[PDB]
Amino acid sequence: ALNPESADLRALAKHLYDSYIKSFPLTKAKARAILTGKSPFVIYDMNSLMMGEDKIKKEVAIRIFQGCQFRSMEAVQEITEYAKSIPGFVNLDLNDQVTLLKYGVHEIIYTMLASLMNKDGVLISEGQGFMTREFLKSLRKPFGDFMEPKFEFAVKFNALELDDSDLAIFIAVIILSGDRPGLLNVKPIEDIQDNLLQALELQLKLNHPESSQLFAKLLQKMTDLRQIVTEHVQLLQVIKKTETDMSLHPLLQEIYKDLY
């Protein structure tokens, strides 16, 4: 049964889920309800892309690219606000706070993007729209190659059948990674992650009692996220050099500076 130590871990899991709901406006729970049948407008081609711009709201390979960078900056702001709620984070060296965010945000972005994905497409614009995976992979130049790695990860990640209360702790574990390059004081970070890892283990045991070694299987997914990011950074360098008229927003540019 529960015991003073495991009780403290339940309170932490409760606090993190709470802050997650407050920081992220589109939960997995809402995303799943939308995807499994309010209904979204579906963008699968050129004309439907124009019908949708009116219903929800090449220059088109560029309009999708910049929809995805505007999106990703919103997520960084949400993640940064969530990070403040992880007990101990705001007390860390401000420079290590920046480093942990710089290296953590994209691994979290792709974790949470999976919540909005099924094998056929991804929800957009707060779930008012749904853009098909075939439409995205049909884009020209390198733009058709960007979103396919994410779908591949999402389909396998989603088979773990995690809910928002599990993910709230998992993304906190991600942020508080002591191996990040350039961290000045690793021990206080590792102490916090030790506590989050304990909280996640108990959460998964209680929330998925029939799911053997879910904890370990989830931790192994950090390998797939790390590879998605480095693959993405490389594609962005290509876009930069081939499309000298396109703009990368200073926030994402600074996150990617001297990353790996």
Summarize the annotated binding site for rosiglitazone as residue ranges.
Answer: 69-72, 106, 232, 256
**Contacted entry of a copy of itself, ligand 570, none for residue 147, CB cut-off 5 to 8 Å set by kind:** ligand 570
Q: Give the DSSP per-residue string, 87-126.
A: TTGGGS-HHHHHHHHHHHHHHHHHHHHGGGEETTEEEEGG
Q: Binding of a copy of itself at residue 201 (CB under 8 A)?
A: yes
**Contacted entry of ligand 570, a copy of itself, none for residue 230, CB cut-off 5 to 8 Å set by kind:** a copy of itself
Shortest Cβ 109–a copy of itself spacing (Å): 17
Query: Is residue 198 helix, strand or coil?
Result: helix
Q: Binding of a copy of itself at residue 237 (CB under 8 A)?
A: no
* Cβ contact 184:98 at 8 Å: no
By C-beta, is 223 or 244 nearer to a copy of itself?
Answer: 223
Q: Binding of a copy of itself at residue 219 (CB under 8 A)?
A: yes
* Helix pair 164-175, 186-207: axis angle to 10 deg: 160
Pairwise CA distance, residues 144 & 136, whole Å: 6
By C-beta, is 154 or 176 nearer to ligand 570?
Answer: 154
Neighbour-count burial for 47-74, b at 16+ CB within 10 Å, e otherwise: ebbeebeeeeeeeebbebbeeeeeebee
Nearest CA-CA partner of 90 in 145, 38, 19, 6? 19
Q: Binding of a copy of itself at residue 223 (CB under 8 A)?
A: yes
Q: Binding of a copy of itself at residue 198 (CB under 8 A)?
A: yes
Which 177-196 residues touch a copy of itself, going by CB under 8 A? 177, 179, 194
Q: Binding of a copy of itself at residue 220 (CB under 8 A)?
A: yes
| Angstrom distances, CA of residue 213 to CA of 13, 85, 154 | 19, 28, 20
By C-beta, is 18 or 134 nearer to ligand 570?
Answer: 134
Size of the site for a copy of itself (CB under 8 A): 21
Tokens of 157: 């990640």
Which residues of this protein are in contact with a copy of itself, per CB under 8 A?
Answer: 156, 177, 179, 194, 197-198, 201, 212-213, 215-217, 219-220, 222-224, 226-227, 230, 260
